[PDB]
RNA sequence: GCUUGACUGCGAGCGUGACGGCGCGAGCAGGUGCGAAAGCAGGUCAUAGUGAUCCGGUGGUUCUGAAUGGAAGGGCCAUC
RNA sequence: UGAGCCUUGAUGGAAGUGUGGACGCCAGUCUGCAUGGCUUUAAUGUUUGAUGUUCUAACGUUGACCCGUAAUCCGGGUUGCGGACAGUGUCUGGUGGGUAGUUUGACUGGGGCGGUCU
RNA sequence: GUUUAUUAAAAACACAGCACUGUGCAAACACGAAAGUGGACGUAUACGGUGUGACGCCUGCCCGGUGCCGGAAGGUUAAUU
RNA sequence: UUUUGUAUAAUGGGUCAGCGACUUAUAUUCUGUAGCAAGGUUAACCGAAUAGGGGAGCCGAAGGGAAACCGAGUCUUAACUGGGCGUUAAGUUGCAGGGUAUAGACCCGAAACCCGGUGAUCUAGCCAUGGGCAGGUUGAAGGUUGGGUAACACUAACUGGAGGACCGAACCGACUAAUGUUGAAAAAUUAGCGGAUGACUUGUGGCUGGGGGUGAAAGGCCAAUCAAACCGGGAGAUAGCU
RNA sequence: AGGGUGACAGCCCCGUACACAAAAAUGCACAUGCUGUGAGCUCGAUGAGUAGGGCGGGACACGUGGUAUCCUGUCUGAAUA
RNA sequence: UAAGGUGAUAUGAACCGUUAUAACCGGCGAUUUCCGAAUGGGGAAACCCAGUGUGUUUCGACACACUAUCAUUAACUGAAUCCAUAGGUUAAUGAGGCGAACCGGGGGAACUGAAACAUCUAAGUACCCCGAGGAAAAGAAAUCAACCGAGAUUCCCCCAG
């Protein structure tokens, strides 16, 4: 479970960089309350490209 | 059912075997927890009964895609 | 006193067992020991002092080696 | 708080007023304290665990309320309590006549007991 | 009072009383792969289990063994790594 | 029949008739017989279907060695003067047959184990709802009223009507004996016997199911069955025994 | 062929050999109408919680054996012509 | 198709037919009570009772149709909560039960054999459950081979006890 960020989020927080966090984290806080999404690969060039 | 409702998993027979080597009738069943996601593509709140992997590939594949197949499928949800 | 014949490969032919097997054996081949030498020595005066097969261990072994070279495993010999 | 590497530790403007440590068999009157033309000793960044605190946001709720609904099921919703504990899955040590399958020799002046078994 | 319907009615079982013990409630416990249900719409003056067996006077010595309760130190010790 | 041995007082048969126990398939070897012979023969299949084709294959004319390998020899050992096994004797395919193997393998026979169902119309316990107990005794607590005390306590009459209380029918039970024992009856009859306002008794319906129920506990009871019900199935369980 | 007929029938009867038969309804071939479906060429694309592994089991004639290979309940986890 | 018929035990009565509507045989229709998946609710199978519609020169009450459940779809409605989902209604389609074996799958014995018995055997058999077809299943190599080659699946005889 890697995914990039949206908001800023403490010991990781960057507007859209790569961190890897755990995977209970992600799929309980993180992304539920917006604010990230997985590296699907599809997403790593939505927020790569800033 | 103790049914993974994303991967389809139940229970399986196998035996037990002691050092005697005495086969003795089980199951092996699937670990099952029934969790609540959070889908957003709904504005609502999902309660699967799941396997971990099962977690594990809702992980991977996105949810969205997961309740794709399921309803593709059948399954209420 | 000096020694390693309590040697290795074999064995005419006998004994005794339902069988598995056990026992006695001159002689031949190699190499060894004692004796001046003829000779004696394949454990102990003899008859108890023992445990089949399987499974596996150790060493040795060009015997085998699942496409080929290998290797694993197997076999054969010694032994546990 | 356990443990490697990068490191905050040193590896093959001179001389002055100069005063605690050093594992140093059994204490170096030397340096600063203001000043003068890619390590044993530990700790900062970690990747990684142990423990303890607190949090909520997984998970539990056989508290309360609301709707489906004139419904002590169920579901959803809000909240309160609890909380990464519990509980469950796989794996695993213990226990386990609760349950289950079986064993528990032969000879023999009947059988048992004794004695015997090469 | 109960019991071997169909050879045993008793001295056997039950009993009120007594004691140990488990049990803080989603109780212990029991039926149940589970949901659930009984326990109880009860809450330690309750409920389960065990033994004894009205009542009277009483109920001594032993914790080595086995069991149960408690024991953060050490030795042995599983998956894992 | 079984036995060392049976007129045996050891087994079996009342009698007759009818049925009633070494089979079948496939493997394999031997003997007989037949065809062909250093060769014999095909299988599935084709099929003009017992023919004809089909030689895939199997057996044999070479053995020795664990084997590589060598080969009328080979193995053994550095090596045999040797020793082991071979060389010298016909084979193979049908057909009938004597054995064997796998099969229920001569026939009948267990007590049992497992699987799925059927049973609480008997009986055990529980649940809900209805019913029954002639007649006769004893006389608890309490009350009232007199005596009694400072008042209580106490006491006497009376009233009152408790109880797994007393006697005894219905009703529920089953302690003794006789009868019965191919019964009137697969547990009864007769005369005695216990309880009879209770942990009593009773009608109807309900619930619990087989290693399970239920059990005031006897291993009792769960349909004349119980140390694991009945029915069906694995099933021709297995039977060194008769 | 066979059956039957007052005892055994080629020539008594029903048949048998042989040869014909469907108004309807249908089984099956082709052929078309209708309905849906896509064919063709160019350039592309090539099956991830998967393969593989650790733990437990199970399948493969193969009993963990030196045991390849398949399946997966559990924890993991690639390359990509 | 026909000279004879009204099935049978089974006579008789009363009849029908003989040149094409007697009867007999075949195709397609018709009617097809009640129970049974049973389907309007209930129920001790063959019975009990409803809702809404129709229906009567005797338009009362009774008779007849429809009214199960679940699934897909559509329409309209519509909570906590505004949206929205849940819920609710209706409409059209479809399923349900049954059946000899064969077939695929989920589960899965013990006797027995080993001369006892645990590993092993019986055996993935017996049985239970789900499902399908006229067959099912399997099937177009991440297969074999052995440096020569082969070319999906299935069945048969060999290989070979
Ligand atoms: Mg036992
Ligand atoms: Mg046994
Ligand atoms: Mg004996
Ligand atoms: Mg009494
Ligand atoms: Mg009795
Ligand atoms: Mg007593
Ligand atoms: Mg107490
Ligand atoms: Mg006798
Ligand atoms: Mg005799
Ligand atoms: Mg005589
Ligand atoms: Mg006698
Ligand atoms: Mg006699
Ligand atoms: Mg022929
Ligand atoms: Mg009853
Ligand atoms: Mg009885
Ligand atoms: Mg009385
Ligand atoms: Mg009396
Ligand atoms: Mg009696
Ligand atoms: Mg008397
Ligand atoms: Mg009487
Ligand atoms: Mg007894
Ligand atoms: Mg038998
Ligand atoms: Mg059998
Ligand atoms: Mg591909
Ligand atoms: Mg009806
Ligand atoms: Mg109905
Ligand atoms: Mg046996
Ligand atoms: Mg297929
Ligand atoms: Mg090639």
Redesign the interface.
């Given at each position: 479970?890697q995914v990039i960020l949206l908001d800023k989020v403490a010991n990781l927080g960057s507007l859209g960089d790569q961190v890897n966090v755990k995977?209970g984290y992600?799929?309980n806080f993180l992304?539920?309350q917006?604010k990230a999404v997985?590296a699907?690969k599809k997403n790593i060039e939505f927020f790569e490209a800033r | 059912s103790r049914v993974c409702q994303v991967t389809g998993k139940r229970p399986v027979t196998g035996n037990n075997r002691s050092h005697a080597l005495n086969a003795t009738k089980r199951r092996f069943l699937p670990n099952l927890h029934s969790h609540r996601?959070?889908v957003?593509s709904e504005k609502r709140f999902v309660t699967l009964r799941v396997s971990a992997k099962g977690?594990?590939v809702?992980?991977?594949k996105?949810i969205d895609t997961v309740l794709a197949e399921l309803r593709a499928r059948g399954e209420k949800y």
């Open positions: 479970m995977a992600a799929r992304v539920p917006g997985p699907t | 996601f959070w957003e977690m594990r809702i992980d991977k996105g």
